Design a protein around this ligand. Structure first.
Ligand code: NAP
Ligand code: NAP
Lengths: 660, 662
């Protein structure tokens, strides 16, 4: 095979990010063997030098001449650092005089945290490294490809980013799932604008047999890594649920934490003073041990204890607690009276190996081809696909025939709920977050106040003027139930403030503060990488920031809104709205599953203000008014307290994406 | 060095149907140049020998040895003749000792007729040649591939068969679109059973630049062919629409036909004898001429006149017409008083070119890559795809980035029709076609009679016993509104009889008479090609045969039901149900668009009794009874008189061509 493809890519120049190991390293090798010139870029010089030396050796044995000039490297290229990516494009043009193929391969694992535990800096790092970097490179390279008459951009996505019309939940990995869904959504929505010169496709492999999944240099594999994270999250969620259940029946949060602080399962289990939830928790913990590990003797590590206290604080459960209201956030890891010893593992290696084979068996049983493809197999497929000239706007699936069955698919709404369900909103508080969508925000505020009899709608805006524009659309009697909160720092602080001032909401509607831009690849005025980064911030990160608070509120429903497009617009705004709809659905689907494992059990659903087909968009004022009214009906459908009456019914109100 | 890609397919053996020209011929060529051994099969020996000679000559140049033995042919292999296909497999094994790749490439264009004009034999020819032929070959080669531990089956589909979760309408081509959708649906639903040894994928190119599309030797190009058939259908549809509007106003059908038989635009335009609909028709026809063609002077050719009378007869409009009911069907082309002259064209060359440019422009404007791919470009993509070892169950799209925007996704049902809309069923007649689905047919009969106040539910069955079982589930007071009609010849005859006895229905629910088989590729008891052909007859052709009559009924709504699976079943029935859902959706989407062009304007929607996710299927009695009730609500949603485009453009579109899963 590897000596007999010299004709496939002869003279083609490829820039490969993360080109030193894994799939990227195999693609670099096979492109070279197929006669291509490669610029391999990555952070570490040592892996890059060894990988390049091995490829150049093989090129010699095949009988290439001038081997040293066919394969080049640039180290210290971090896909989260845009300046270093511009350096990679400049080095490729200096070595080779052109770029034919851009392979967006580099990907980080990301935060590996439930959304309620994930940091904004960790989320931003994952989205910058995995998604915004790809747009950065396309921005710089696509014009060179269009000027020479040809090029190919390939995004390396994942099966866990979903497929066209079918989102997938990836619990504990929402930042990663969104970033991978984003890579594919870019291909689906932007390939139109890269044509006719540039092909733009994605690959979506699932788990891949090589050193990183296997485990290399003392380090455990990805199935084992996921298994360990599942057990950590199970213990956090179980201690968290006990504390919340105790607080819900009126145990003081200081009394729960004072008793958790003693961090002794034996004592807590047999102590009469401890609330029943904590007694039961400690009994259950005490039965889970193996004889070496410590988790049967201690409830918490400092790390899990820090995550527990942050969840309680974020839910507003410290607002009336003397000590805890003022304690510095920097001491969240320091409140346990005793801690597991450094000498022994917290988690039992048998329960880790069992969770790891449940994860593995789960994927392995869904492969049509019976075995996980190797890195070589995925690289081979990639190099074959790069030779085709008739495909654009598609995601190839070199996954082993991986088929995870799910019913999480964008639906067009035409249906309603019972006035009895709506009458449960009477006297309740709801939050609407928004700015530019005045007609939609006003009709929703009207529906909640006038049709559902909510006592208070807190309209959280970027500016006072945004409030005034919505208030001016309501009758004076309806506006009497509209409260203004203008963001002064960040949305989480505005949500913390709304909660402390006016109480716990029953419904939170999240809408973007800013309209989409009307540009993408136009030579005159293109969307710059910074502007695209801001689109991601305003339409994806914004929802994550609202979601990470909302998911901690008892008896609350969360509704996420994807972007509108102005009537009669013919710009790439429509393509950007469909990019957001797809990418946000990965978030909605994943968060809906994570929230069902949390004691707060918050339903999450998505409403879309842009249709799939641009000619079906509203085209006159009657159709606009129909859509505004349908939007408010969809918010009430997924935002009013949910009616299990049925296994089918229960699935249909978590993680849905509904278009109006 | 520059031409060496032998690493991709050295020593792999391919059988390619339609291997002598077009995409198939270029696939055979590029597989051979990539080191593959090929058995090219087709009808004509002469074309096969030229194709084989050119490949063998091109091999010898780029320096292969043992070259004549690497490329073999078998003539007289026709995908509509299953014995000849078995021969092709035996010849591949004789020549090369194994088969690695099966390329299901041969296909026919099919009937090129609207559903309401298409013959059952034309439909059956298309499905046998394009779809059942692929299963026939899969049935014979899959066990060979499983026994050697590896293989690849590639179905050559079309972009106009749609894509996963997104059907596409292909008006005038419903037989072809179903066959192409079927090729893809086999990949999506059966790859699990061909694994782990066998990769099973499709390709779905759009229009492909080569001899076939351009046309040669005075034979029209595909765009020009589609253009002329659009003009012929537009004239048939316009004459038919004028006739129907005249009959609706109360002009006797014998009167309308006596005037049409004069076949003279100028006299019809001016004569006051003539109903307003025919005068306006004649005036429009009279202004469409180019000075050469005759369609401005005659309304009809014998062919269009035969198609018109067939539409009127099948709508029951001859039931009270003495001369016409008794006319033999043989004479449907013989009733014009004058026919266009044989030497001059009926249709104007200029409007054909303008319809062909309109079809061409619509396609080209939707290509991301700006240019239609060549045959060579599609074949090259195919040969690169066949070297991959990690893809199964996918459709590749070497189309030039062809993107036709539509909103035909399959959806789960959570909907609400207003009681006001359901109340328009009061006093109306409904037809339910079925046999095996007793609980669903009974709850649907009960919903129409008790919740919607229909006067009459005609339950059209295969047997009296099937009627007796539905009737036994109903209260005596509901059962009073249930009428039995047992099929005695075919479903079309049973519909004509139901119409003649009990009048025009408001809703027709089509359900398959037979349950799906519980097998597919099992070595012990596989689904044979004949059994698979009966699945196609019972679950696709069945709905075609109902739809062809229903689509001619004023103020009727048509509902097509895809298969159920028995609770607890773990067989390939579930995969067959999903194969049918996808394939039937191509029919549903295409028929909804054709019917809007017809004067009758019959809505068509699909309801699916099987979910996409097997763990989501009903697991106990309670979940079964819930699904049964939800099915009957779904039939009411799409079966009651629908929303007008005038009321809402959005809502009008939702209720036409949908596929809804309960
Ligand atoms: N492996 C799987 O199971 C799997 C499954 C589905 C999808 N994928 C996708 O496949 C792609 C390749 O993953 P892999 O598992 O083959 O990777 P891997 O073996 O970890 O190799 C990653 C390569 O990327 C480089 N890299 C890592 N972080 C980087 C950063 N911040 N900036 C620049 N380069 C970086 C590495 O070198 P340095 O560390 O020196 O930078 C190395 O060259 C990713 O896009 C991933 O999401 C992988
Ligand atoms: N070309 C397009 O525009 C286009 C677009 C989308 C999809 N497709 C699909 O692409 C495939 C290839 O079509 P093409 O356009 O390349 O076809 P084509 O140019 O007509 O090629 C015909 C080849 O098939 C053979 N053939 C024809 N009828 C046959 C029959 N009944 N049984 C066996 N062999 C037969 C022909 O030889 P004999 O006549 O000697 O039998 C010849 O070898 C078909 O599946 C079609 O649905 C084509």
């Amino acid at each position: 095979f590897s000596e007999n493809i010299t004709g496939l890519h002869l003279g083609k120049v490829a820039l490969i990010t993360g080109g030193s190991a894994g799939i990227g390293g195999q693609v670099a090798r096979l492109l070279a063997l197929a006669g291509g010139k490669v610029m391999m870029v990555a952070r570490r010089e040592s892996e890059l030098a060894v990988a390049r030396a091995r490829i150049v050796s093989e090129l010699e044995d095949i009988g290439f001449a001038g081997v040293e000039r066919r394969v080049q490297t640039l180290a210290n290229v971090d896909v989260s650092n845009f300046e270093s990516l511009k350096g990679a494009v400049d080095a490729t043009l200096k070595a080779f005089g052109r770029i034919d193929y851009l392979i967006n391969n580099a990907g980080v694992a990301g935060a590996e945290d439930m959304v309620v535990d994930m940091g904004v800096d960790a989320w931003d790092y994952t989205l910058d490294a995995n998604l915004v970097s790809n747009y950065f490179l396309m921005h710089h390279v696509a014009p060179l490809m269009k000027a020479q008459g040809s090029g190919y951009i390939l995004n390396v996505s994942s099966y866990f980013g979903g497929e066209k019309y079918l989102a997938v939940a990836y619990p504990n990995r929402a930042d990663y799932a969104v970033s991978k869904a984003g890579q594919r959504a870019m291909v689906e929505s932007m390939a139109r604008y890269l044509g006719p010169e540039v092909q733009f496709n994605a690959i979506a492999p699932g788990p891949v047999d090589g050193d990183r999944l296997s485990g290399t240099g003392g380090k455990p594999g990805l199935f084992e890594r996921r298994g360990k994270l599942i057990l950590e999250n199970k213990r956090l969620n179980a201690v968290h649920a006990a504390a919340i259940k105790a607080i819900r029946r009126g145990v003081r949060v200081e009394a729960v934490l004072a008793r958790l602080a003693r961090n002794d399962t034996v004592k807590m289990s047999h102590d009469t003073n401890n609330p029943r939830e904590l007694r039961e928790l400690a009994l259950a913990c005490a039965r889970e041990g193996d004889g070496t590990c410590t988790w049967d003797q201690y409830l918490l590590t400092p790390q899990i204890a820090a995550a527990l206290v942050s969840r309680l604080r974020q839910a507003g459960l410290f607002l009336d607690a003397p000590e805890w209201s003022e304690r510095p956030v920097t001491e969240d890891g320091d409140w346990l009276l005793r801690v597991p010893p450094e000498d022994a593992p917290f988690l039992p290696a048998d329960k880790i190996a069992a969770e790891a084979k449940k994860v593995g068996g789960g994927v392995l049983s869904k492969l049509y081809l019976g075995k996980m493809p190797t890195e070589h197999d995925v690289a081979q497929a990639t190099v074959f696909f790069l030779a085709d000239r008739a495909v654009s706007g598609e995601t190839f699936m070199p996954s082993g025939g991986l088929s995870v069955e799910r019913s999480t698919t964008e639906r067009e709404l035409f249906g309603s709920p019972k006035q009895e369900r709506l009458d449960q909103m009477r006297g309740k508080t709801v939050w609407i977050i928004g700015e530019h969508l005045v007609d939609y925000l006003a009709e929703t505020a009207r529906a909640f106040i006038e049709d559902c009899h909510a006592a208070n709608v807190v309209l959280i805006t970027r500016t006072a003027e945004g409030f005034d524009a919505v208030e001016a659309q309501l009758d004076e009697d309806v506006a009497q139930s509209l409260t203004s909160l203008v963001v002064s720092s960040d949305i989480e602080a505005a949500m913390d403030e709304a909660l402390s001032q006016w109480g716990r909401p029953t419904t939170i509607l999240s809408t973007p503060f800013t309209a989409l831009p009307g540009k993408l690849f136009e030579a005159q005025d293109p969307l710059t990488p910074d502007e695209f980064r801001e689109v991601v911030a305003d339409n994806l990160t914004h929802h994550f920031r609202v979601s990470r608070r909302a998911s901690l509120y008892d008896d609350c429903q969360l509704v996420l809104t994807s972007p509108d497009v102005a009537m009669g617009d013919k710009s790439p705004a429509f393509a950007l709205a469909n990019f957001i709809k797809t990418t946000l659905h990965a978030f909605t689907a994943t968060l809906a599953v994570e929230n069902e494992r949390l004691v707060h059990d918050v339903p999450v659903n998505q409403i879309n203000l842009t249709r799939r087909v641009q000619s079906e968009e509203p085209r006159d004022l009657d159709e606009h008014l129909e859509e505004v009214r349908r939007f408010a009906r969809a918010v009430l459908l997924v935002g009013a307290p949910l009616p299990e009456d049925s296994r089918y019914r229960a699935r249909i109100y978590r993680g849905m994406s509904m278009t109006v």
